[PDB]
Specification:
The chain is of the alpha/beta class and about 250 residues long. Helices cover about 50% and strands about 15% of the residues. It is built from 11 helices and 10 strands. It has helices at about 1-10, 20-30, 50-55, 80-90, 100-105, 110-125, 135-140, 145-155, 175-185, 205-220, 235-240; strands at about 15, 30-35, 35, 40, 65-70, 95-100, 130-135, 160, 195, 230. An 8-stranded parallel sheet has the order 9-8-7-6-5-4-1-10. The protein has a two-stranded antiparallel ribbon with strand order 2-3. It is globular, with a radius of gyration of 17 Å. It is classed as lyase. Keywords: TIM, Structural Genomics, Israel Structural Proteomics Center, ispc, lyase. The assembly is monomeric. Optimization of the in silico designed Kemp eliminase KE70 by computational design and directed evolution.
C-alpha cells in the first residue's frame, strides 16, 4: 500500500522549496525524479520565467508552474489581489493560488471572499490559468468556518480548494482535509473542484492518509492531477525513500 501511495503522491506533488534563481533552477531539477516527474512546482511569481526556461531545457515542459497571490496574508483588498493575479498570469503561471480573505470572513464578511475569489477567477479563466483558493484552515480553526470558506470559494469559481499557506504554524490536518472534501462532496462539485492539503505534509505516511480520505469519499479514480495535489517540499525525499530511491 505505502509504495503505491507514495508514487501516486509524487506524481501529484506541487513541489516547493523547503529564494533565488539558483534555488529555483535546483527545484526544477528535483521535480524530474528517477521514478517520474511531479505534476508541478510552486514558486513566487518573479521566478516563473526562469523556471519555465529550466523545465523546457531539461526536457520536462509538461511540469506545470503554480504561484500564489494575496499571499500569505489573505487581506481583503480585491484591487491588490486582482493586480497580483494579473501579474502572475503575465509572468506565465499555469495556476494561481489566491489566499481567501479569512480574517474578513471571521469578522462576519462573507461577501468580500466571494467577490475576491470571483474577480481572480475571472482573470485566470480569461488566460486559461487555473485558480485555487487557500482558506488557511489553521487560522479559521472551527469546522463551521472551514466549511463556509470552502463553500464560498466554490460558489465564486475556485478550481481547487487548499488548506494552508505554509506560512502560519498549523497547516493541513486529516480532519480539516476531510471537512473540505466533505464540502466538495456535499455540493456535488467533485468533477470541477479539486483538493490540495498543504503546509506541514512531511512524510509518506502523511500523504497516504490524505489520499485514503479522497479515495473513501470519491472513489479511488477521483484523485487525478486535475483534482488533487500535494503542496509540499521535503515530502519528496520521504516519498522517494519509500520507493527505494535515496
Amino acid at each position: 500500500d505505502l509504495k503505491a501511495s507514495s508514487l501516486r503522491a509524487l506524481k501529484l506533488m506541487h513541489l516547493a522549496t523547503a529564494d533565488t534563481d539558483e534555488k529555483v533552477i535546483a527545484l526544477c531539477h528535483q521535480a524530474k525524479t528517477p521514478v517520474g516527474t511531479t505534476d508541478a512546482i510552486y514558486i513566487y511569481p518573479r521566478f516563473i520565467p526562469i523556471a519555465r526556461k529550466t523545465l523546457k531545457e531539461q526536457g520536462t515542459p509538461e511540469i506545470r508552474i503554480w504561484t500564489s497571490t494575496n499571499f500569505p496574508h489573505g487581506n481583503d483588498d480585491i484591487d491588490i489581489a486582482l493586480a497580483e493575479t494579473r501579474a502572475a498570469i503575465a509572468y506565465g503561471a499555469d495556476g494561481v493560488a489566491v489566499v481567501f480573505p479569512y480574517r474578513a470572513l471571521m469578522a462576519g464578511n462573507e461577501q468580500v471572499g466571494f467577490d475576491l475569489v470571483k474577480a481572480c477567477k475571472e482573470a485566470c479563466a480569461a488566460a486559461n490559468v487555473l485558480l485555487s483558493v487557500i482558506i488557511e484552515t489553521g487560522e479559521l480553526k472551527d469546522e463551521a468556518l472551514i466549511r463556509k470558506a470552502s463553500e464560498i470559494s466554490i460558489k465564486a469559481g475556485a478550481d481547487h480548494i487548499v488548506t494552508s499557506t505554509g506560512k502560519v504554524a498549523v497547516g493541513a490536518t486529516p480532519e480539516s482535509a476531510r471537512i473540505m472534501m466533505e464540502v466538495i462532496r456535499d455540493m456535488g462539485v467533485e468533477k470541477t473542484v479539486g483538493f490540495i492539503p498543504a503546509g506541514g505534509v512531511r512524510t509518506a505516511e502523511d500523504a497516504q492518509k490524505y489520499l485514503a480520505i479522497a479515495d473513501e469519499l470519491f472513489g479511488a479514480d477521483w484523485a487525478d492531477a486535475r483534482h488533487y495535489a500535494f503542496g509540499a517540499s521535503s515530502l519528496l525525499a520521504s516519498l522517494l525513500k519509500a520507493l527505494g530511491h535515496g
